[PDB]
Symmetry: none
Subunit: 39 residues, 4 copies
């Protein structure tokens, strides 16, 4: 089915954005931990 594959596609686009958000949150966390080095 090209509809099934179309569905997989749509889910993959969403997972891409979800992973990009996880990355961004981890980068933020990284900065927080950096602060604490001398602080």
């Amino acid at each position: 089915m090209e509809k099934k594959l179309e569905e997989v596609k749509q889910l993959l686009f969403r997972l891409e954005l979800d992973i990009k958000e996880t990355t961004d949150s981890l980068r933020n966390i990284n900065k927080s931990i950096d602060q604490l080095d001398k602080y």
Copy 2:
């Protein structure tokens, strides 16, 4: 420091859930592909 760490910790709990959810969506995608292959 202890306050910041608690905020980081809480965030890491939510990221774990988000990652595990992504993994789950991928395993379901894997199922869909397998079903097409079976066909």
Copy 3:
């Protein structure tokens, strides 16, 4: 404190493990796709 940092460190190791499952699932989809390539 020591305790909170330890809990954070453990959490980061769990995310390492969780992310490796994501990577492994991706790899398994690729394998399943390759099977289609042959026929599909």
Copy 4:
């Protein structure tokens, strides 16, 4: 399941690169954690 399949392959590849960013970020975090242990040690005894 051909042109569509190729689209899916492109997406799975993109997702692989996205995940690599996530793993790199985790690696950098750990590096900052080790720096934080260095400090904590030196600033104590």
